[PDB]
Subunit: 63 residues, 3 copies
Amino acid sequence: TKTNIQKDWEQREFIEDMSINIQKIVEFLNKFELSTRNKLSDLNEKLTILDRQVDYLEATFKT
Amino acid sequence: TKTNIQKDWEQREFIEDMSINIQKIVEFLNKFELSTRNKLSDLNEKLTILDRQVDYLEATFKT
Amino acid sequence: TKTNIQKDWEQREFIEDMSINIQKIVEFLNKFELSTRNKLSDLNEKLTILDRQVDYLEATFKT
Ligand SMILES: [Ca+2]
Ligand SMILES: [Ca+2]
Ligand SMILES: [Ca+2]
Ligand SMILES: [Ca+2]
Ligand SMILES: [Ca+2]
Ligand SMILES: [Ca+2]
């Protein structure tokens, strides 16, 4: 119960919307890779600072 | 060596399968973003607990 | 100002390129999930080693 013109418009919109969704996925991955990398960086940095604090406490106690 | 009917069916299946694959990617990203966020949460929480333990040990030793 | 032959070629290339981009996204997700999992592993392992070091220092001090 759609005309050929309506059906063709809908089929093209479906394909156009996939092109948009693929771009939205790529943009999300760019943001999420950066976010994740920064968070991992920050955790590593905090662990490195705490490791130094523990090694100094060891040295102060053992001496 | 395919009829027009077979070729048209295959071309449509190809496009339909892309729509399904994009949805599978979106569902995976939803799960993976949540997983990653929770794991990062848990590591931060464990580091915060260990930091408190180290600061208390410092205070007990220095005093 | 394109012939029908040119327009049909371009429309098919557009759809073919989406199939390629979806595969590139899947390949990236495979690599990024593995990378992220390994990095999280490594942070957990480093925290577990530092936790053991802190517990031993506690035991040595308290005794
Ligand atoms: Ca549109
Ligand atoms: Ca349109
Ligand atoms: Ca189908
Ligand atoms: Ca079909
Ligand atoms: Ca091509
Ligand atoms: Ca082609």
